[PDB]
């Protein structure tokens, strides 16, 4: 009935970062994870395995077991012909046991002797290659047009892929339509988060996937011509006119103000979505946002507990003979002034299963893949000071419990066989880390801060102090750039950009206390700015190169190194794009971030760089050149500080 | 369909000859690391091994495991016929798992008993001969003509070999063409610093490899007498007319001024390179270079943190059962005055995994394989003083963390250890002075110091013959590339001349190139300025020029150059200190008085 879709899930993508897995007698389990959308059903599942059982393995006694959601799918005994050789195995997977979240676990049973044997012998291994995969077939279901499960058909949280959500307009959008689409894109990005954002833009065209359609009583796409006129903003979930398995979210309104009201209702009142059509009556902003109040950032009004940092329950606990590391994500306001702090105070309350005798078992605390401190297990609330030099906008805290498991072996005459006992390790939810004793002071421009948190615009999570400058009649590429650059900011903040202001004149921003975002090229007034270190015309580009580009500089800007050495102007037909940042001429505390492209291919490259988190993480400094090869960043230009340092700190640190 | 290249690698750790690599229970791992050029793929790979397993090993329980990027390529179980005898075993390597950086690991699983096994038993060993290695067959690809990867096909950073980059002209170059070629060679040497640099020169002959072609409207090579006339300096990436795998970079311009502008654009504005052709419109300098601002050298204006000495992240940390040594490279300007103070102060912050009980675990600090001082790991700050007499050449600072790994029969899984050297560790060089007697060829052969005091070679004039030969251009390109490699910066402001009358009465250093085979390097004081100097690169025969270039590009030969005059002949390299001795610098009066009194 519904359309089908064949996917191959290679172990290198859905496995631990190495991709491969060596199953031993002491660590016999290894799992892969995959989810299923609420509008899809698996009709055919097959697990292809490429593994090499160790020689010296007893053939029929050594086996490899495959589990799906703790249900046995089959067993692969190690035939004598397979000892020490690469083997190809096809294990069918029953679709009746596939649910929203699915774990496929490989269990290895291994024996090398008919007599006394050591489970931890290093000769009992079976490594599964990363070329192994899980072939799946998905069939789309005809879900009913109910506005409950509102995001589900468009963004499904059970799907870990990039949320590709097309947006359909009648034509070139006006300022109000651009603002409403930006609000919707920001909300969808905040919902999708780490999965990624992608908003293809179609003008008067029906797409082949689930999409959002913006319509007005006057300006509407072709397929909505027969739709009756509306008296209020109406949100309808209708079927695709040609594909009943494709859903359309039609945001209909009398005009741009009605569409804006509907977008705000989507952003702030989606909990009341029901039926097949909803009319938005009024959204009342009772309370404004405060600086640095993004839901995805660490609160700075009081010490934050580890419970408020975990994203899912049972995250701060691990079990097993060798328990997996515990990871806590620390997201901070990018302008936290930590250049002077000796260290950040962190009180850790950790519980573990004590080994019977004193050994070298320990718990290792690692920040951003760097070892910080170690605590011996054979020893309440421990005080740990983490240096602030390596604290960025996005941080990862890892707690590794290295266990030396002393298992007896008896004597030479008489052996003993033991059953290993698993260990339990817990990091308490009462553990706290304090970030409330620091000020907001950053050496702008910081394209790293931009690409990591949208800082100049995410200082207010609703983007109320941000103005976006767009061309008069933007095309699909420019609208895609705006939607993607708003969606990724929404993803980092966790809050939709309800109060974002989009302008077109380019001169109304004069004398306004707002950070500026430029998409369709720098206006004439700001084009002659002396702080711009990179400008891209249709085919002519010039850049300013710093005196010294240290690969790993300290947090101190070192303005002597950042001084521009030479300015080189080059012209070519090859595509390029750039993101630049400079001080606003109208306010010393404000900033301007401009996304520049010279061609459709340049816009494609810029959009890909914005969408890809890995490509974004490579942006730093003041200018980020995007080419076919990749992204190259320069730390060039003047340094201006945004924030307020009280005179207490300045006087205290004047005398060291 | 392209050319193929065969290489043979050898295990990294191995041992000094005539030793061999032995894998034991403590660390049964042997690794081979190699990088891949972006224009090459591996067509056939194979690991040849010559190993002698211990005669007291359980045969089939003991195995050899080969990994490639943490992917098992195969296993080599020990056989009863192989116990105590030399065994030759081959293991194919799948090219599908080869990436930019590759690691081939040999893992040893050893067993001598069924119960009560001691991992530290002396009977668990596997000797691997030095003849064991990896046989690879690279194949050259036809890469796209994109300047976004501008240096990739000419100088590949992932290539560890010497970068041989032929330079093609149209004839005897003029002064402007010489200057532009020198700028380009300086930039390429700067990009390929610690690896060798060689720039063969051809006058009207296309080469068989990647090359840089300099052409003007009036003067073109024979194969370029079809390109339309250009109205601006143009840099173009084109295929070789008879070999689509060779690739050429064509620097086309109206005249020598346009070629110079294109060279400066290559040196500075390479971040804007895109497409198959770029047009350099204007390279406008804004700021000059201060002395001793070469990026390769340590800062002399403020204390240097260890983070700024890092070439890659995670260099200062190491993990494992026995963590590997941590190496920091220090390049010092070869004029610091260290005849007054005892040494150089160091502040070191290091964190480590504490052993469960106090033992003889220690950290060793080594300077150029010379043991300096050991510290004990038990409780982490540390203040050290380093004597400084290795100016110019690169210095390796090694931190070796040796753990005793005490034994708690009973079988246990060993726990890995983490050692970290802080990025806030500080070494100081800002509060010193610049003073050494200039007429030393060691300073030249190590850093190009008289000319490298300014990275851009602003205060340097080069004198060349009227109609230079291929060898006469090659020596200039080689020396400018060597200076660029030592500095880390292109020589954009280098001045070349054809007649010696311009250098009269100029406050700038002079580098003269002129004339069985004899090659001589002469250094003496500049007549027109007491603080300047002149280094002459003289050679009579073309063979003499060739051996001079070989000496200047060979590190071992450069290490045998000292004094004021060096003479290069087929019998060897001889250098005798002749002439007077004078000093350069700005030593204060009271410091001079204190030094004289001391």
Residue numbers in the entry:
A (entry chain B): 67 to 445, 465 to 741
B (entry chain C): 67 to 445, 465 to 493, 500 to 606, 659 to 741
Copy text verbatim from the article accompanying this structure deposition.
Bacterial cellulosic polymers constitute a prevalent class of biofilm matrix exopolysaccharides that are synthesized by several types of bacterial cellulose secretion (Bcs) systems, which include conserved cyclic diguanylate (c-di-GMP)-dependent cellulose synthase modules together with diverse accessory subunits. In E. coli, the biogenesis of phosphoethanolamine (pEtN)-modified cellulose relies on the BcsRQABEFG macrocomplex, encompassing inner-membrane and cytosolic subunits, and an outer membrane porin, BcsC. Here we present cryo-EM structures of the E. coli Bcs macrocomplex positioning all seven BcsRQABEFG partners and multiple c-di-GMP-binding sites.
We demonstrated previously that contrary to the canonical 1:1 BcsAB assemblies observed in purified samples from R. sphaeroides (Type III Bcs secretion system)23 and G. hansenii (Type I Bcs secretion system), in the assembled E. coli Bcs macrocomplex BcsA associates with a BcsB hexamer whose periplasmic modules of alternating carbohydrate-binding and flavodoxin-like domains (CBD1-FD1-CBD2-FD2) polymerize via a β-sheet complementation mechanism between the FD1n:FD2n+1 domains of adjacent BcsB protomers. The structure of the hexameric periplasmic crown is refined here to 2.35 Å resolution and reveals to near-atomic detail the molecular mechanism of BcsB polymerization, with more than 3300 Å2 interface surface and a free energy gain of −22.5 kcal/mol between each pair of adjacent protomers. In it, the synthase associates in a non-canonical BcsA:BcsB stoichiometry with up to six BcsB copies whose donut-shaped periplasmic modules assemble into a superhelical crown with stacking carbohydrate-binding modules likely guiding the extruded polysaccharide into the periplasm and towards the BcsC periplasmic scaffold.
